[PDB]
Amino acid sequence: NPAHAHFESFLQAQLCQDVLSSFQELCGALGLEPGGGLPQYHKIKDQLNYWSAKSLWTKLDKRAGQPVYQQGRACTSTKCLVVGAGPCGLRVAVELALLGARVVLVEKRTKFSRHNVLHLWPFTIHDLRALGAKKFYGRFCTGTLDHISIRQLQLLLLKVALLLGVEIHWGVTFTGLQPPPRKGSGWRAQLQPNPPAQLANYEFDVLISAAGGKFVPEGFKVREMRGKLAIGITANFVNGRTVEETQVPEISGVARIYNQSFFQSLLKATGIDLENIVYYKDDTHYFVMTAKKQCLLRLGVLRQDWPDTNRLLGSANVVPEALQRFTRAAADFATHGKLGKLEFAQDAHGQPDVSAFDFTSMMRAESSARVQEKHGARLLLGLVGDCLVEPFWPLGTGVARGFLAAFDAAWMVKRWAEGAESLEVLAERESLYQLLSQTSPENMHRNVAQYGLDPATRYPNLNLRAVTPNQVRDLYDVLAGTQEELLRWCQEQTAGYPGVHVSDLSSSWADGLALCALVYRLQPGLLEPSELQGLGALEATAWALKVAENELGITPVVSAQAVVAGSDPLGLIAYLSHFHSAFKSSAVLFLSKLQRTLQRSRALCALCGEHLYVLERLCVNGHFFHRSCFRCHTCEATLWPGGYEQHPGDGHFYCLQHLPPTWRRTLLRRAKEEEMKRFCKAQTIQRRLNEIEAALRELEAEGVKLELALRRQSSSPEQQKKLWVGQLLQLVDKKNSLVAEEAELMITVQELNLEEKQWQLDQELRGYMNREENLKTAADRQAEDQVLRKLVDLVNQRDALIRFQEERRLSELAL
Ligand SMILES: Cc1cc2nc3c(=O)[nH]c(=O)nc-3n(C[C@H](O)[C@H](O)[C@H](O)COP(=O)(O)OP(=O)(O)OC[C@H]3O[C@@H](n4cnc5c(N)ncnc54)[C@H](O)[C@@H]3O)c2cc1C
Ligand SMILES: [Zn+2]
Ligand SMILES: [Zn+2]
Fold first, then answer.
1. CB-based contact 378:371 (threshold 8 Å)
2. C-alpha span between 132 and 130 (Å, rounded)
3. Is 115 annotated as belonging to a binding site?
4. Which pairs are disulfide-linked?
5. How many CA atoms lie within 13 A of 753 on its CB side?
6. What is the β-pairing status of strands 102-107 and 79-83?
């Protein structure tokens, strides 16, 4: 039959134009018009007797037979417009089609020309399989494979949407909305170029934007989360499908957190300075990596060091040949050269498929839904995909969170069609959206086979009232004195101590007894007799600083000499504000004491000469540096307690790494998922650290500007000075909170580092211990002697860390 051949060509097509032509021919052979909705899907299923393409109809009917859809009657009177035909746009189009609505989709492009590989969560894999992914794609997730190229996913979803009866227009670009000018008329979309009269005269009730990237409809507010400057590089190599390429195992690594030996070896051998790397064995060998500006400049990948990052990575600034050599070297070192000769795949323009991207900042919208009313007509606008939350590619959360957003948007549309008020709909949507940025395979229902539109099948302990309708009224359209409390708290804490009085916040501390009194009051029964009978001339202040640093976990901001001299009042104010914020109602102290023990176990900035300010100060060994000046001399990496050392010979700091049946299937799948979980944890830690560093830089710059303005203009009114000091104290509080969070992160980083080092050391020990009595020499004995003490030290540190964690958990469960 002609219909059978047409259906086979439709299933096996590999190009968008081929899919469209095959579907047009198939609909012509059946006397049908594409875009007829659910009725034409029923007609195709009934009138196509294939006897081998029957499991597909079973899967589609099982999916469409859920009670939530009400047999395509939940949204039978609503009209929708989807902008963009990416994976998320096609997914939401399919979801809206199943509910029984009329879906019109518009795509700017006319081809699917993206070969990059996306990672898939288990529920995403099950969801795609339930739609008949194996029929449309033979190699879909066979074995432990959990990824798919962008164009293959797009083709699969396009075939499903075409079968379900969705009208799709290609080459049309959405630009804006046409408001109704008269009563009784709906909304229309501005499209470029001039569209067919049927499309241009189409009035819709729902607008779902899935344009991804940075596109956003007017009326939506988007804010970007920034980070340290990172340069991403993606590359695709042709996969020969030979056996030798199949035994090559996939690898992944993150800087100094996960799989560090790879990065150290790669830097030592080739000179490639990377931050993270991920490799995928999909239809093409896919490599994604992160690199820094210095290495790219050194190797000639970039021409000039332009401060503007937009011009830094422009087409006129990158050298394609240098980039190709860079990527080839990184890839062939990553896979031990087992892949043989690597030959780049070709993109749409015939160039090699290697590219560079900006990985610094990610956009995200403040709200995921809006309502606009004019002449009594109401329009609901929703965001799905990258246009809602921009993903970090190495983390592999794009498809999963896009699908979750699509499900939530379809649920919102179904609630909207029921006649519920706009405010409650928006409140529920925002309540659901509040959880999107923290979604993970671990904190959702483990029964992924029961997922659906209803949020209760996906989000545990769901609260649909987490946002009240009064907080979303702006999304509906119709057409200070911290100083006084600080002084009062100091006065009330100093009270009861004999021989002291606090009348101000600047000169009362010159005596030096007040600091000791405060430290004694915070923790009772520490000391007293030594200072009373002792001289205590400028030594009381230093002792108070030392005991506060070593016991109360508060780093000093102002030197004791400046305290007694009174030449640094703002530093004293910042110190007292840290005291006030700490006990207004730890990890830093633990890290400091660990660094002190490591240092003992061996038994005006002073580096750059520019003036230090109150916020940029960082005190160590009794000396103050810029927070940004504390880096290793060789790798120029940020130093943290417990992993740095100082050489008195040169007076420099160096890091420790620079200091001179199906049972087998299920088992393998669980092992791969655990490895992916570890990598994701490390990558999330690294990303959060970069964000914290960027925020600290921004707040330090702002505080320096404020403090310089306060100092230079000494004729300002007193109230403005009070306001400036209040803002400075708020900045100090924010900086302290960020530092505490960073210390919390470094605790886990240290745990991971010691675990990895212990594993490597035991592997080395078991390698040494394989030699028998016949193979014995002084070298083996020395190796055993040198490794045993290392194992002793690491296990001692492991007991120290588990003791700290046990104490923390006991304190948490105390209350
Ligand atoms: C070049 C590129 C490379 C990527 N590489 C990776 C990678 O290696 N790993 C990874 O995890 N993620 C990667 N992504 C992101 C990945 O595509 C998304 O995570 C995921 O595909 C979600 O797609 P989306 O529909 O939200 O956005 P997209 O698929 O990017 O956008 C949807 C579509 O909307 C269309 N469109 C745009 N503007 C308009 C308009 N005005 N009118 C009509 N249609 C419009 C575009 O043609 C686009 O194809 C990449 C994205 C791009 C653009
Ligand atoms: Zn400095
Ligand atoms: Zn170093």
1. yes
2. 6
3. yes
4. none
5. 16
6. parallel
Instruction: Name 401's Cβ contacts closer than 8 Å, sequence gap at least 6.
Output: 389, 391, 436, 439
Which residues, in sequence order, are bridge partners of residue 695? none
State yes or no: 80 annotated in a binding site: no
Cα–Cα distance for residue pair 218/360, rounded to 1 Å: 25
Resolution to 1 decimal place, in Å: 3.1
Radius of gyration of the chain (CA): 32
Element (H, E) at 784: helix 778-814
Tokens of 151: 């164009």
Return the number of other C-beta atoms located less than 10 Å from residue 228's C-beta. 18
What stretches of 596-732 adopt beta strand conformation (E)?
A: 617-620, 623-626, 644-647, 652-655
Residue closest by Cα to atom 14 of ligand 1: 393
For residue 289, give the nearest of 248, 333, 320 by alpha carbon: 333
Amino acid identity at 518: L
Residue 241 token pair:
């499908």
The alpha carbon of 756 is separated from its chain's Cα centroid by a whole number of angstroms, namely: 23
Gap between the Cα atoms of 619 and 640, Å rounded: 13
DSSP string, 96-165: HHHTT-EEEEEES-SS-----EEE--HHHHHHHHHTTHHHH-TTTT-TT--EEEHHHHHHHHHHHHHHHT
Strands 617-620 and 623-626 come out as antiparallel
Tell me the three state secondary structure of residue 799. helix
Structure tokens at 543: 């002792």
The CA distances from residue 704 to 296, 566, 580, 734, in Å, are 32, 21, 22, 15
Calpha distance 791→786 (Å, rounded): 9
Q: DSSP letters along 567-611, please?
A: --HHHHHHHHHHHHHHT---HHHHHHHHHHHHHHTT---TTT-SP
Report helix, strand or coil for 301: coil
Of 120, 287, 393, the one to substitute when testing ligand 1's pocket (max ligand atoms within 8 A of C-beta) is 393
Distance CA 374, CA 364 (A): 28
Q: Delineate the domains of the chain, giving CATH numbers in brackets.
A: 2-170+205-223+365-476 (3.50.50.60), 227-360 (3.30.9), 663-814 (no CATH)
* Closest residue by CA, ligand 1 atom 6: 116
CA of 216 to the centre of ligand 1 (A): 13
Burial of 740 (0-12, 13-18, 19+ CB in 10 A): middle
- Hey, is 52 helix, strand or coil? coil
